[PDB]
Structure formats: structure tokens, C-alpha cells
């Protein structure tokens, strides 16, 4: 026990704490010749001469068994008062009062290390790219807002004659009664913002913006040089079925917004606690496997953890986008999934607004609650530690960062990126919310890393790591996902077909009465079905196949055009300075 | 003049020809210490000790101005009789009598050099992969042939009652008279081969096969370690308009096969002479640009030359596939392209058979005529040279390879690959024809390289070069192109919709009368148009939009499924030994 530690200390050669007599901490420094020897064995760069991050790396499992209590570097100074580097970049960068200043990226790679430097460089560059995407999203938001007097469909669903005379079918078995449509008017008014031509121009822009983000980040990186799959499928089913359950336990502006916000909040609570669960089961799964190296361990953990997180966070959104209300048929013979399991018909405006509210609640709530957790949990852990003098004694009573470190940090921003990219065709303010989150996110990551956490050992990484193929896969998936959101989720394509193709005798006015289908009780539900009385009644009509062929042709045209533009831009940008 | 050559020879130090007194050839050898010095300046590998390819590279513009007559290595021996390496791999590899033996790839990199070795390794591995793709293509060809008694549509177009009672519309202005359909029966019978379920399984297989080809070739490479764009657009228009012209100058089994084979032959003749033209204008264009290095010169030449060759060879095929007969409307108001320019309505079986004949003529004729040129042109040039003793005198009178060398060789196989991949859904025997071409292609490239050409200087290349992104782009384009061939070119999707979707009251029998549309003279042309007498007469009907929505959904499903399978296979194959 103590013999192993004494022999290891004698090999390393080859004070106790004033507050706790049982703990003893040994100072570790290197001589000049030994530093030059370790700097020859590890080929460091050249122009007191060795930097403190370089010294702490060159000086850098036995503590995993519990023999050694703690091994760490030491901070330079207290942040609250000057001794003095930590005080400096706390005073001008890490403080929330210095929210507007530029990041001292050379100072952050000086003090913390190039993985922390590359995370904060990626975070700041993400913020600057999100500023461009956010002002274009504000431009398309103004395009939707100022043309609210020209959206003919919202003005005729808000008018009582065209909108109120619908009396559309119930989406629900026990009474849930059939209703005049003008009550969705206050939900439809903002819908003129959320699927107009402005958000289509924004989505086609956002494909290009993701491409520019990736290529100029490649340039900035160039400058700055089997049971678990079955469990994932069970998770895929689980998030959808509790999305249904939270909508049901709610079901037993104001009414629709209360519905969407309340169900989104309670589902988001389940999302967070199931996220902690998924952290634990994925770490148990990758510990059941034997990984040979820590890097292969964290790559496998990155893939499995991100797949569980992808499933957990976006499966509700994918249900609302592509599965909710998409497979329901006519009110005669509704689709009972397993018997007595009638699926949820959507509102006639579409499930885009419900997707929008769920997106902004999950995104902004993960932002708010994750920053609250990132502040408070190390702070309250240090507080209950302090409720139970030398420098290293002060630096001892800090929550250690962990073996992974910045991993979860990257993870949450990648999840934020999946809201910025995969669902950007729903609401254009996703880069704005991401920007206002990221401006504080640099400060909260900075502040907890400076104040609350022990100093992580500096070590260089040439990129973000295994998150880069994840981001490229998210980028390729974003084109398909935005195409299915504009085609399948929103209703922009049916009114596009109504204006361009059926103002003709075989304008935009008269769209709402001409879209829906009348239903015999043996009301006008939202579907394109040949009507009681037509020879092919309740089968899909000519107009269903016209609109769905325009949907599929839009998916093909938009995907091929955007993928060729992404190819032309990745081929045209030299990817170097 | 002679002073520059004398000074260069004196720097190099730092016999005349018996047949021609004006020419003098100096032997060039290196001493042992100078060879070790050049082998230290160029870091050669280690285990008379320096190999002859290595010696010829280490010993290796003034001849471009015309000062030096010729500078070359020397061959080891005459091929016809032993002196003796060249005689050996001529006797057992390069001879056409050794067509069945394996390639001595270590001997070919010993004698010729690693670019020639990697071309012949790529050629042989291409041949072995084509053997697998060819036996699967023969399997789907047997699937189409043995089920010829079960193709209901061909048996009812060959029957006089269902097929002969059509009397379909003329595709032509001056009389070209309307005709009973059973005359396409002998063309439709083999059509039961060419678009059945077997070729669909072959196309979905061929996406996987291209993927396996690319990944195992990555493994084998790992083991074996602005005016011109406007001219390209003018070429794009030019090949299509002379495809129209050769069809017209023909127009002024037996009748349709005579048409297709004759027009394909005369167009292919124009293809070849315009290919020589495109060689010359592309070499003039890349000489008008100043390239800094020979490698950047040949990369730019590779891109421009392949783009011109792509346009030249496949623009006729792309016209037949995606533009011929696709944009023609109903016989009332035909599409005159510029006035008095009625486009060519296709046969009711589709333009797939015309595409098939054009493909096999262009592919097999480029194979035959390119091997005939590859044999004869160096042979006849050496013959007229000989119509006007030491070793170097014999090796002097050979056609030199040129500065590019194997470039055109790679080029033609890449063009062959574009027939193996981009149009594989038309006829499944494309890998078979490629296999029977490649077995002789190794021998003709081997034989002309051994007998007729001067020995190219050995120099190492780690891959095929700039053709590898070209092949990956051809591979990505192949999925889209095969999807548009199965959907848009062939008629497999309309009969798939007829069987699965309209045997119902709103079997495969009755497909031909139910596909076409009747035409009032104010006959049954091949289109899906609402009929004289329907309220929406000659507009597209329900069934057009059903079939074209199934086409577009097939494109989306097939592209996404195949691209995910390609991603799973490229991610699952470790790309290393
Ligand atoms: C890679 C991640 C993204 C995957 C996207 C999944 C797409 C699923 C959407 C889907 O198929 O929905 C079925 C319909 C959508 O048209 P809708 O008119 O919404 O369906 C009827 C609903 N309503 C009458 C009550 C208004 O659509 C169809 O009927 C056509 C089916 C073709 C879909 C193929 C897309 C991608 C395949 C992998
Ligand atoms: C990248 C290299 C490959 C490019 C492929 C180009 C595709 C062009 C094919 C095309 O659009 O043809 C028009 C129709 C095809 O349906 P058809 O029924 O052949 O057209 C009517 C012909 N007929 C009545 C005489 C029998 O199709 C349509 O009407 C739907 C238009 C959507 C096409 C979008 C595909 C790719 C866009 C870049
Ligand atoms: Ca956060
Ligand atoms: Ca963070
Ligand atoms: Ca050839
Ligand atoms: Ca050849």
C-alpha cells in the first residue's frame, strides 16, 4: 500500500496540509537538465524559457485505485485578487463584466492548453459565424413580419367568413368537439412568420452557411496548428412514447401556447433526467467493453454518447416533424397503432408551430438549465466542501474536472448545432438564440474553468477531435432534414402549388377551403383526399399526388442544388490561408 | 547551339550511329559513389545492388527546343529472342499466348516503374472486380431471359390482339405513318431482358460493387505503397445536335436494330474524330495557361481533358436517357425547340433500348477501335520508320511515349468505367463487355509498351493520381444517374405502379392499353395524359402524377438507401490490411 507509493516517489526523485493532518501533498518541480531531457524526448517548439503549460505537460491510474489522493498542477493566483496570469484573464476575459471584449486566445493557450484553446477558438468562431447567420435570420424574420398584411391565408383564416366557416373535424376520440377554425388564427398569424418565403431563403442560405462554417473552420484549424444498438432502438421508441404520454397528461395564443409550452417543459424535464441516465448507461456500456487506449476510449464514448444524445434530444423533434400526423388517414378508419391507439391528427396549419415551440423550449431550456447547472453544481459542491493558508490547500478543495474534461462541453454545443442546422427551416431565430446563448456560454465555461475547477493538464489537440466527423455528418443530414421539413413538415409547398398551379381554371385567395377534404359522418379535416360523393372517395385525389410530387421534386431539386453548391464551395475555397 | 550541348555534357561528366552519320548517341552510366550520393539525396529503399528502374530514375526541356535529338534509357533485350528480363515478361506475360496467366506485378514494377506498376495493378484489380460484377450481371441476364415467358407485357405486345390493336400515333411530321404496335415486339422481347427486376437488383448491387471496388482499391493502394467552360457548353450543345443530325441522315429486329446500330456507328465515328479534336483544343487551352510544374500541368490537363471527354462521350447517352422524348408533350402542340423543330417522341417501350444499343456500340466500339489504334499506330509508325547493329540504334527507332505517357491509358479506362457505372441500369452485360475488353486490354497495353514504345523513365506514384477524385465523383454521380435511369429512362416504375397499385378496382395483364393516351385528330401515343372527352383533356391525369410521384419517391428512396449503404460500407471496411 504505502510501500508502492514510497517506491514510486523514490523513482520520481530518481508537506502535510495545515487543515487536515491526514493528507500530505508533495511539491513536484523539474530541474533544467531534466526539463531539457524531457523536451528532447517530446519535441517541443522553440522561439522561465519553458512555458507553464509546457512545463506542466512535460512534467506530466495509480490514483484510480485509491492509493494517491490527488495529483494536480497548481494555479498561478487567486482570481479575486492579484498575487499573475489567472487574475489577468479573469479580470479582462472570464469576468461577466468583460462580456464584450475579444478572447485572449494566445493567453488561453498559454494558460490552459491547446485543447482548451481549440475549444474556445471553436466556440468564439462559432459565435462570430452565428452572428452572420443570426442577422440573416433576423432579416428573414422581418421578411415574415412585415409581409404579415400580405399573407393571404392567415388573413382569411383570421377573417370569420373564410376561416370561421370551416368547422373542421376532431382529432380526438372522446368528444374533443369539432370546431370553427378561427381559433387557430392567433396561432396562424405568427405562422405567417414561420413558413413564408423568407425562411425558405434562410434554409437555402443556411446550407451555404454551414458549408462556409466548416470550410473556414478548416482554415482556422490550419492556422492554429451490439446490445447498445438494441438499447438505442429501445430509446428511439421510448422518447416517442413518452412524448405521447406528456401530451396526454397535459390533455387531461393562450390555449395552444399553453399546451405547447407546458408539454414541451414537462417533456424537457424528462429529457434532462433521461440524459443523466443515458450518460450513466453509456459509460457503463463503454466500460463493459475494454478500450485499449484513452483516446480510443473517448472516441468510442464519443460515438455511443452522441448517438444516445442524438436519439434523446431530437427523437421528439423528429416525431413532430416526420411522424406526428403524417401517417394518419381519413377519419373513417383512423390509424390505431396497436388497437385503441389513434394517432394524433395535427392542426390544419401543420405541426410546424408545435415543432417550433418544442424546438425553442428544448434549445433555450437546455441553454438556460445547462448554464445554471454549469455554474451552480461546481459552486454548490465547493460550498458544501468549504462548509466542512497554503496555495495547494486552496487549490485542493475544488471539484476536479474529470478524465473526459471538455468532452461534455463539446457535446452540448454539438447538440446546439443540431438545433441550429437540422431544424433551421422551422424558425429562423435559431442562430439568434444560439448567438445570445454562446455569448454567455464563453463566459460561463470560462468562469467555471477559472474559478471552480482544478486546472486541467495542458495537452495539444489539432482539431475538435471525433466531433468533426459528427459535425460533417450533421451537415450532410441537415440538407435532407431541412428538405423534409420544408416539404413534409411545413405547408409551404401546398400553397406554392395552389398559387402557381391552381389559380388557373383547371392568386393565393381561396387556399384554405380548397386544401381540406369534407367528411361524411358515416367537417373538413386537414388532408388531400378525394371526397363523400366522388367515385374515388377518401382515396388520394389528383391534388394529393400533385402536391406530394411537388414535395418530392422539391426534395430532389433542393438536395441536389444544395449539395452541388456545397461541392462547388468546398472545391472553390482553397481550405488554406 | 552546339556550345550549349558541349557545356552541358562537360557538366554531366563533372559514339555515332552506324546507320546515320549525322546522329551521335552518348552512353550515360553512373559510378558507385555518385550513385550512392544521388541515392542519399533521393532517399531510396534498401533490403547490381541498385535496380535498373532505380538506376534509371536516379540517373534521371533542352530537347524540347530541339538541341538534343533524343535522351532515353535502354531496353534490356529484344523481345523476339533472348539476349534477359524483357524477353521473360514478354514470353510469359506480354504475349497474347499468355492471356490466362497472372500478372508479374513485382516484375512489372521492377522493369517499368511504380506508375506503370500501379496502372497495371489497377487494371488487373479492375478486371478481377469486373469478373464478380460480370457474373452477377450474367445472373440478372439469366433472370431476364428465363422469365421471358412470364413478362406479361412483352407477351401481350407480341400477341396481335393486345399489341397489334394499338395503332399508335406517328412520332414524325411528314407522313411517318401511324402503326400497329406489334412491330416493336421483336424489340420488346429483348426489352423483357433489359428492364426486369433482375436489372434493378443489378443496379442496387452495382452501387455496392462500386463501393467495394473503391474501398478494396484503397486497401490495395495501402498495400502497394474561363473560355474553356464556354467551349464545354458549346460542346454540350454540339454533341446533342449532331446526334439529332445523324438520326436525321439515317432517317432519309431488322428495322429498329438497323436504325440504332447505323446511327450509333456514324455518331461514334464523329465521336472519335471530335475526340481527337478535343485532345488538341484542350492541350492548346492548357498550353495557353502557364502551368508552373508538370504535375500541376497534368492535373489541370486531367480535369479539363476529362471534362471534355465526359461531355463528348456521354452527352449523347445523357440526351437519350434524360432529354430525348422526355419533354415532348401531346401530339396537339408538339414541342418545337426553335420553331419547326419537333422533338423526337420515343418508342412506347421507352428510349432504354436505343440507349442500350448506343451504349454497347460506343463502349464496344471504343474498345475495339482503341485497341486497334493502340496496336497499329505505333506499329505503322515504326514500319514507315523502318522503311527508310547496335542496341541503342534499335531502341532509337521506336515511337517515344510522350510527356504524358500513361495518361490517355487511364483516361480510356475511366471512360470505360463511366459506362460500367453510370449507365449500368440499362443493360447488365456492361461488366461482361468490360471484362472481355480488359482481359485483352492488359495484353494490348503490355504488348505496345514492351514492343513498340521507348522505355518510359521509372518514377513512383502512390495512387492513380487525379483520376481518383474523378472516380469518386463518377461513383457519387452513378447513384443519381442509375436512379434517373430506372425512374426516368426505363418504364419499370409505371408497370410497377400498374401491378401494385392498379390491379385494384379503383395482375400485370392489361398494362399496355391502360398506360397510353388516346388522341383526337383535331391513335395512342406513349404518355400519361388525361383524355378527347375528359374535363381536363390532354392535361396530366391522376395516373401521371401517381407514376411520377412513384418515380421521384423511388429516386429519393434508392438514393438515400444506397448512399447510406455506401456510408456503412466505407465506415465498416477498415480501409487497411
Ligand atoms: C434521413 C433522415 C430523414 C428521414 C425523413 C423521413 C420522411 C417521412 C415522411 C413521410 O413519408 O410521410 C408520408 C408522406 C408525407 O406526406 P403528407 O401529406 O404529410 O401525408 C399525409 C398526412 N395528412 C393527409 C394527414 C396531411 O410522404 C409520402 O407518402 C412519400 C414517401 C417517400 C419518403 C422517402 C423519404 C426518405 C427515405 C429514407
Ligand atoms: C446530376 C445528373 C442527372 C440529372 C437528371 C435530370 C432529370 C431530367 C428528367 C426530367 O425531368 O424529365 C421530365 C419528367 C420525366 O417524366 P416523363 O413521364 O418521362 O415526361 C413526360 C414524357 N412522356 C409523356 C412523353 C412519356 O420529370 C418531371 O417532370 C419531374 C422533374 C424533377 C427532376 C429533378 C431531377 C434532378 C434535378 C437536378
Ligand atoms: Ca450551455
Ligand atoms: Ca458549455
Ligand atoms: Ca481500349
Ligand atoms: Ca489501354
From Swiss-Prot, chains A, B:
It catalyses: a 1,2-diacyl-sn-glycero-3-phospho-L-serine(in) = a 1,2-diacyl-sn-glycero-3-phospho-L-serine(out); a beta-D-galactosyl-(1<->1')-N-acylsphing-4-enine(out) = a beta-D-galactosyl-(1<->1')-N-acylsphing-4-enine(in); a 1,2-diacyl-sn-glycero-3-phosphocholine(in) = a 1,2-diacyl-sn-glycero-3-phosphocholine(out). Predominant expression seen in epithelial tissues. Also found in skeletal system where it is primarily expressed in osteoblasts. Changing residue 268 to W: Slightly increased lipid scramblase activity. The keyword Nucleotidyltransferase does not apply. Changing residue 365 to A: Requires lower calcium levels for activation of scramblase and ion channel activity. Belongs to the anoctamin family. The term 'anoctamin' was coined because these channels are anion selective and are predicted to have eight (OCT) transmembrane segments. There is some dissatisfaction in the field with the Ano nomenclature because it is not certain that all the members of this family are anion channels or have the 8-transmembrane topology. This is Anoctamin-6. It comes from Mus musculus (Mouse).
Amino acid at each position: 500500500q504505502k510501500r508502492k507509493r514510497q517506491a514510486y516517489e523514490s523513482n520520481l526523485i530518481c508537506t502535510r496540509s495545515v487543515s487536515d493532518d491526514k493528507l500530505v501533498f508533495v511539491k513536484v518541480h523539474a530541474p533544467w537538465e531534466v526539463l531539457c531531457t524531457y523536451a528532447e524526448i517530446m519535441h517541443i517548439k522553440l522561439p522561465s524559457f519553458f512555458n507553464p503549460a509546457t512545463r506542466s505537460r512535460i512534467v506530466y491510474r495509480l490514483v484510480s485505485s485509491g492509493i494517491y489522493k490527488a495529483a494536480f498542477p497548481l494555479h498561478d493566483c487567486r482570481f479575486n485578487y492579484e498575487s499573475s496570469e489567472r487574475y489577468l484573464l479573469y479580470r479582462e476575459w472570464a469576468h461577466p463584466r468583460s462580456i464584450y471584449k475579444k478572447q485572449p486566445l494566445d493567453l488561453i493557450r498559454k494558460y490552459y492548453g491547446e485543447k482548451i484553446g481549440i475549444y474556445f477558438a471553436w466556440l468564439g468562431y462559432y459565435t462570430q459565424m452565428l452572428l452572420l447567420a443570426a442577422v440573416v435570420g433576423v432579416a428573414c424574420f422581418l421578411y415574415g413580419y412585415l409581409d404579415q398584411d400580405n399573407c393571404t391565408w392567415s388573413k382569411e383564416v383570421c377573417d370569420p367568413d373564410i376561416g370561421g366557416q370551416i368547422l373542421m373535424c376532431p382529432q380526438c376520440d372522446r368528444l374533443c368537439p369539432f370546431w370553427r377554425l378561427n381559433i387557430t388564427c392567433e396561432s396562424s398569424k405568427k405562422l405567417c412568420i414561420f413558413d413564408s418565403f423568407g425562411t425558405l431563403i434562410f434554409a437555402v442560405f443556411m446550407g451555404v452557411w454551414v458549408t462556409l462554417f466548416l470550410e473556414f473552420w478548416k482554415r482556422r484549424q490550419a492556422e492554429l496548428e451490439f446490445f447498445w444498438i438494441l438499447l438505442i432502438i429501445a430509446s428511439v421508441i421510448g422518447i416517442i412514447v413518452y412524448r405521447l404520454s406528456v401530451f396526454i397528461v397535459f390533455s387531461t395564443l393562450t390555449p395552444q401556447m399553453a399546451t405547447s409550452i407546458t408539454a414541451s417543459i414537462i417533456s424537457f424535464i424528462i429529457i434532462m433526467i433521461l440524459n443523466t441516465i443515458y450518460e450513466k448507461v453509456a459509460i457503463m456500456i463503454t466500460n463493459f467493453e475494454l478500450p485499449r487506449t484513452q483516446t480510443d476510449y473517448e472516441n468510442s464514448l464519443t460515438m455511443k454518447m452522441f448517438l444516445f444524445q442524438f436519439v434523446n434530444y431530437y427523437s421528439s423533434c423528429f416525431y413532430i416533424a416526420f411522424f406526428k400526423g403524417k401517417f394518419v388517414g381519413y377519419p373513417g378508419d383512423p390509424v390505431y397503432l396497436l388497437g385503441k391507439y389513434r394517432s394524433e391528427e395535427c392542426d390544419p396549419g401543420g405541426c410546424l408551430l408545435e415543432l417550433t415551440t418544442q424546438l425553442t423550449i428544448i434549445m433555450g431550456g437546455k441553454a438556460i438549465w445547462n448554464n445554471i447547472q454549469e455554474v451552480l453544481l461546481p459552486w454548490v459542491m465547493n460550498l458544501i466542501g468549504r462548509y466542512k493558508t497554503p496555495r495547494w490547500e486552496q487549490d485542493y478543495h475544488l471539484q476536479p474536472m474529470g478524465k473526459l474534461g471538455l468532452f461534455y462541453e463539446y457535446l452540448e454545443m454539438i447538440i446546439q448545432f443540431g438545433f441550429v442546422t437540422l431544424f433551421v427551416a422551422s424558425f429562423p431565430l435559431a442562430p439568434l438564440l444560439a448567438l445570445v446563448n454562446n455569448i454567455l456560454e464563453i463566459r460561463v465555461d470560462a468562469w467555471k474553468l477559472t474559478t471552480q475547477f482544478r486546472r486541467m493538464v495542458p495537452e495539444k489537440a489539432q482539431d475538435i477531435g471525433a466531433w468533426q466527423p459528427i459535425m460533417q455528418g450533421i451537415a450532410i443530414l441537415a440538407v435532407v432534414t431541412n428538405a423534409m421539413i420544408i416539404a413534409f413538415t411545413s405547408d409551404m409547398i401546398p400553397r406554392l402549388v395552389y398559387y402557381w398551379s391552381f389559380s388557373i381554371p383547371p392568386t393565393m385567395d381561396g387556399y384554405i377551403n380548397n386544401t381540406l377534404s369534407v367528411f361524411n359522418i358515416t367537417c373538413r379535416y386537414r388532408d388531400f383526399r378525394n371526397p363523400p360523393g366522388h367515385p374515388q372517395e377518401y382515396k388520394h385525389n389528383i391534388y394529393y399526388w400533385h402536391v406530394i410530387a411537388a414535395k418530392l421534386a422539391f426534395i430532389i431539386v433542393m438536395e441536389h442544388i444544395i449539395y452541388s453548391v456545397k461541392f462547388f464551395i468546398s472545391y472553390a475555397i482553397p481550405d488554406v490561408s
